Amino acid sequence: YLLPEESAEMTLNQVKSLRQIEGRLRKLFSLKNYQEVMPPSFEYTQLYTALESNGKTFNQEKMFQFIKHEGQSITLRYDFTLPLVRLYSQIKDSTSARYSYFGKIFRKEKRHKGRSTENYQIGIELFGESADKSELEILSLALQVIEQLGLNKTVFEIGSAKFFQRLCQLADGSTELLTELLLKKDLSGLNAFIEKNNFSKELRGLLKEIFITNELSRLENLVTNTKDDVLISSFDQLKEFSEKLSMIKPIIIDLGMVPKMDYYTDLMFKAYSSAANQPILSGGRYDQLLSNFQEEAFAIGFCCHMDTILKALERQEL
Amino acid sequence: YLLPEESAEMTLNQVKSLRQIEGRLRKLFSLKNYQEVMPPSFEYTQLYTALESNGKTFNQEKMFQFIKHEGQSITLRYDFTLPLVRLYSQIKDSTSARYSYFGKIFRKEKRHENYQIGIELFGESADKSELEILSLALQVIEQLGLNKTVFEIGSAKFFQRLCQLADGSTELLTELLLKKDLSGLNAFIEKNNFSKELRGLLKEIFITNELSRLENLVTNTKDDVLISSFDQLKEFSEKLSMIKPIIIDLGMVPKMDYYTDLMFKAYSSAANQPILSGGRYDQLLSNFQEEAFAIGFCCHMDTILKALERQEL
Amino acid sequence: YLLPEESAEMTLNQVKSLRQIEGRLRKLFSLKNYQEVMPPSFEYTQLYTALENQEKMFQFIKHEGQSITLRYDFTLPLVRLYSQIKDSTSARYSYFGKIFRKEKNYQIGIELFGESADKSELEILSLALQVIEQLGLNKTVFEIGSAKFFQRLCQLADGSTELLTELLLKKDLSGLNAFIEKNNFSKELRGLLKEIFITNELSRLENLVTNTKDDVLISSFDQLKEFSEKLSMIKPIIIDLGMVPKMDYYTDLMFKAYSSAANQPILSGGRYDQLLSNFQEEAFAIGFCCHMDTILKALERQEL
Amino acid sequence: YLLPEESAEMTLNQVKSLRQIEGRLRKLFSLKNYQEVMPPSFEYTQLYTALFNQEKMFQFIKHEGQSITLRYDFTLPLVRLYSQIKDSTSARYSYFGKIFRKEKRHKGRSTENYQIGIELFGESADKSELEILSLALQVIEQLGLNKTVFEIGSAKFFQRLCQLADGSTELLTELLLKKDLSGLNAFIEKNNFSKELRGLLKEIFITNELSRLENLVTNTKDDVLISSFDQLKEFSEKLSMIKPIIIDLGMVPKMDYYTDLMFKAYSSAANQPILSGGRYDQLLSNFQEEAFAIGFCCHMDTILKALERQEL
Amino acid sequence: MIKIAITKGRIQKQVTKLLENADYDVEPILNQIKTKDDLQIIFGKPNDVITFLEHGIVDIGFVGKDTLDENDFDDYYELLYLKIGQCIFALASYPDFSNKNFQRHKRIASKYPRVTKKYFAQKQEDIEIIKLEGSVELGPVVGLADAIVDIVETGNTLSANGLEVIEKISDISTRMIVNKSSFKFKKDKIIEMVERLEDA
Amino acid sequence: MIKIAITKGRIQKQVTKLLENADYDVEPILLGRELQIKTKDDLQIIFGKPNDVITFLEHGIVDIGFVGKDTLDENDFDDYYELLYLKIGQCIFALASYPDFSNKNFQRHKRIASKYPRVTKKYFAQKQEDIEIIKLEGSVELGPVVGLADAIVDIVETGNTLSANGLEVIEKISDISTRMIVNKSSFKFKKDKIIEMVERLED
Amino acid sequence: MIKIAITKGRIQKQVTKLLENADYDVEPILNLGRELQIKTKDDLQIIFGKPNDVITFLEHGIVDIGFVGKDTLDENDFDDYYELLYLKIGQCIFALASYPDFSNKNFQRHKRIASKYPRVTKKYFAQKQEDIEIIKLEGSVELGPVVGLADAIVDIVETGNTLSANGLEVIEKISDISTRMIVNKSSFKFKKDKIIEMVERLEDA
């Protein structure tokens, strides 16, 4: 008759369609040599809480947990990356690993709203492979997946945490603030911000702009004018990606991008659908994570938010 | 690092393998017109403990549950058939439904996830249904890729009737059959004033499936119900022989208390547990909608995969 | 830091005050021959089933893999403890502790098993009234009711107990009228229903009941009337025919006492033979319980 | 039917007898001006783990979805309750209840541990230690146990001892706990320990004769050790009139946060201590500021057990 | 004395009115008061009147069934019930509603999620409830939801939008709720007022 | 072939004995230090302690296994078939203690010692009485002799061990005897041989 | 007087022996069999039993001093005692035995080890960082790897004659084993004298 509220219900069609895409992506992933892995459904909460990012993504209040026999605190799959990162540590051969996953994560969201609790994701991880090769391989794949999804109007955005980080330090080290500013594109708070400080013309001109434009030429200049090696350097890496992947799909460069996670190493990227409010795909490189376990290696990957993608597929037909 | 005793860990190869069979089965199912449905991950405890069993008190000890914001008891998917039986009650047009599912349930084990693949069939014609499911079940097995397997079928009507005839001691006989407790049976028979026939049968169903041997023993009882129930199974043994020799287990104990009549399970020699268990259970549909024909099986992927490994060696 | 929504903190004075009452009550009980028992803190979830929700009880799993629960109730463990006696004699138990439940609990009670029918009821009614006088509350009322009367009331109400119960609980006067409408009930039965909802005046009720030309109801009111008379000297008793049995297993007598300073009852009890039957045979089970929390909350809200 | 291993069952008499002792003790505490406090039944597990093992404590999840635990300890909540009072005065608390912790089955171990104890926060250093030791001794006289001993030790002495022993506390600790005489010898063997330090180590393990220890201590010529010992010696002489005190230099502080004074009282009819206490200022500075915290605890389960094994 | 709380809305009038038709010193001079009949009255929003009664800030409280049904509070008595007005909870939507048979669960927008839930429960149909505090008609208009559950009095609000009642949920009307403990002791006065307020 | 495991104890004798009378190839040298052997009837046999015999059968190490009811009731394992049951040993589970047991009315909880905790517990359950179970791996008679426990739950065959200590049976718990348990899977596929041997051993 | 418990096995011999060289009324040989409790001229009410039973007895204070092997003291969860003396006699040791090709083989599934001491096996595989499956065996743990039941085992290796005879070799020494003298804490608190006296004497020999 009636099921709980914290349970999403997919319609046959939704299932048929979700199961289609999987087929396409599955064939694609297997072709690029990614091995699928199924993470345990329960994890020791100690594993999830050891994290705090640049926002709101790892609090014990979003996760469903309870007590086991010996009496410890276990939690329902809250994230896919970690377990795959762990798996990679348990390896005794220093070789690259190509993992992929097709499941859902369980996190709590307020009541009486279109917010879903059951989040079905599809994503891949890449551990150990070469530095540049890595970044390129993932960005490519990410674009390929988007082509198989079947959404009409989509955008692929990339960015640099270093550029972000650097930017921050140039802004009087006010990262706690600049971040809030960038997240809300709070234009009136940024102006106020700039007023209280004695920022150079260039830096000020740059801040003001990165919040509202991705036109390469325009940004290119603003950057080189800061005469800052770091900022110009990071920006050129993005430009390079823009150029190398331009033939596949027009890339967009968002310098005002705020690192979803506080551990992102440098490259970060997300793609949006004109028919969805949330991103259909997000990913980037996060070597840092590999550190919590095994040594320093190149870790990067993305994740597809199927719920949103399917939602976009419907709001799309209408 | 370190994981729980609650969580299971499949190796790349196992997943590769699992995902392979799904492919084959998905193809099969879609070919037979079975739509896949994805049941919610959370359910109201009131739905499980309630429908699962009867007359007694079902167990909330095997299921992971907790409380919600409003203050209710929710449970992680404990079962697949129910939510699909529900999904069928919510339908208006009185037509047949062919559902399938590919996921896992969550139960606690007391000393050591449970990934299942199954299909349900609601509404279709009685005769046609039983035959349809048994074919399909047989067809699935051939895609699994296991070398030595057996397909067993039984009848709850036979079992139920068997119990009444036996001084209605179903509580006990069930326990005997379950442990194949031969000496216990002997003692059971001794205390009672049963017939030669009834006795001769009891002793046999416990240890053999030879069609001929049983056929007689049954007809000798001159019981319309037992001979009836048996023939229906004999019929299935004949119609499905060409596909794969079917085995009849008159000493089969209905897994669920709500099984209507036909019930079956398939085993692998490299598997202790059954790789495929199903049967007809109209009763369930009753919990919501009216009386209709509900029948379906379930493949226990875990066991099947375990069988595939312990097999290669 | 902060504390769980489940953890209640008493102030030194609350404790001093709680411990005082116990003291007075311990002396009272021991004088009436009630022996105190300390029921285990853990119990098998399977036992808390006799009361007919696991969502109100704290529970977890043991080493072997079972469902244990924090003391959710006091009566059962004591009833159990009485079963474990093959000596067919009366027992007078008392308990001073707390139970663990969830909603949005220190209790002090007594149980009486095996004693004579009529003597039991009277003894407990007395004791409940003597305890109240040791509490220290200024304005309180002692109400008594009859499940039989309630039950008989329902069957006469076209047996739609599920509804009237909901009506009496909310004193939903308009709903009752409507209810009387749809089912043309006899003038008497109707007349009674409208009243029991809003009055305990013995003279007023007495008549309405004897008019119902019903042996059961009149019989039940009489048992309460009697009580009213025999205990009147101790404390004016109040008869509430509109009382809804708190527990589905109450035999007949049931009672609760309230303070003007506390929304909830400070004392609730009654006879529930039914419970005894879960273990042993049929015997007379009856005993009340004081809700200390409420009693102390009332003591405070009282002084101001 | 029956009952679960997780629960202990006291007999009427056991209840009568426990409640009796509480009475005497209640009168005693109220006379010394000790106010009783009843700590919450549930605590945020974060409070317990933060100073143990979550594997000994019963826990579960609350509505909002956090980890709450059944009272596992009495001292903490009371310490907390003292932090909530900004009045920089002395506080005398007492508690009569039980804590819940898990144990192994079929060994006869209990889950529900009834305790009665007192805490003292804020009072003078020198005065506190004396008052507590006094009360502890008085309490024991009300229990009604025939043969008992009252042992006191110093954590600084222990700690000093450890540093003097090549600072290998991890090991010496284990040695003293098991009184591993042969393990001690071997320990002495491996590192070039000095005659004095050696003769001490060997001795503290198996004796409490004041005179004997006195010398051994002064011979080490260590200010800390002789200092610690004297403090103890003093208590020995001051409370000697009440009850012959016993000094255990081979005493291993039960809790890692013990400041210095620590003690335990045993019964000849009980394998576990009937009373154990000590000063632990460290706890207080985990909320408020540095103050003098000291208080004991009476293990009723053990005490009663002793009272029975005593009559036979 | 007797403490009363009334909802500031249209109900305040019904009450002040009824109190008049039965004699009590009506005082519409406000912009907490006392009357000559010992009635310290207080005013506020329904959910607030209830909140006052819950915390015993008052003994009697006059609110609408519509709120009482939505509000999770249950610890009170519903003695009197002045059947004034004609509001009714209903399920509104576009005419082509019942004829359309989509392939999934429907979404309803409502100011009363609990009622909306409770109703769709007896009807066997899990749904997505979207809450709206203002004008719920927009739900289906803007495309937010398929249907709505709101209070329909004259129906002048739905028609004007192209919506129609699909089914009557329940009858709505102003009620007289009373705090339990207040009724236990002040049972006389509370009853006296009930009997008087009833003669009208 | 058929893999069988037998308990090294007295039961080893009953089985090797029964097999004999069954016309089966006994190799009695089985007074022969190897752990694994073979017979002419395709019977790879193994030996060990009951709880182990059971462990071997549980993991599919062997198809048939001969162990005692006393162990089968205690061991928490359940997943097997108890086909045959050679009623030989006159062992029985019982509650032994000093004569003055039932007459004493203690206010405490009667603690019983036993080598079978689960059977002691299970038995005291149906009898309505929570108790303290003290486990003793051997000579459980001491329990009451040293004062460790008030009574005990052990197996009584002749009763020569209890009387020699002043102990007497208080109540018979259940009959004990050597049983033939079979691994379920082994029975769905080797169902023939398993039965064949079952019918023979039945004589 | 002093109540002592000794393990019936070989250990019994070791003790009876050491007691002799310490000059005691060692008389367990004469009332050897059906008798479980015996008194001496030195006020020693001695009792015999299996190790785990000796410890049980000591735990409940049925006896003040107990002689058991380290192998059991590590496995048995009990911990509330004093390991005063330590007669270094038996050269037994905990080891991880298995077939030679063990360390050379790469396993896919988890290594299942058979053992009579699951807690030691567990404890040992913890410090080595490796979650494993422990199969309990009360009898001859050598069979585990033989029949196919387990890959390796955790047992006590004295001479190594049992392993070699089956084609098994030690993979790693876990810890040294030896008969110890455990004492009940409380008993040591009040009867500290005698207990020490005996400890000093048993050490002399």
Ligand SMILES: O=P(O)(O)OC[C@H]1O[C@H](OP(=O)(O)OP(=O)(O)O)[C@H](O)[C@@H]1O
């Ligand atoms: O009498 P009817 O024509 O059927 O109108 C009834 C509706 O009008 C009122 O809301 P309103 O539109 O005033 O919005 P509000 O609740 O935000 O004040 C009322 O709450 C109903 O929703």
Ligand SMILES: O=P(O)(O)OC[C@H]1O[C@H](OP(=O)(O)OP(=O)(O)O)[C@H](O)[C@@H]1O
């Ligand atoms: O002949 P019965 O009267 O049945 O006695 C046989 C006893 O011997 C065995 O125990 P154990 O190996 O511990 O030897 P024990 O006789 O010294 O107890 C067995 O468990 C019985 O307890």
Ligand SMILES: O=P(O)(O)OC[C@H]1O[C@H](OP(=O)(O)OP(=O)(O)O)[C@H](O)[C@@H]1O
């Ligand atoms: O290294 P070794 O000197 O050869 O001695 C060690 C062996 O002795 C023990 O056997 P147990 O007493 O359990 O007898 P069993 O081997 O016959 O089971 C132990 O289980 C080893 O198998």
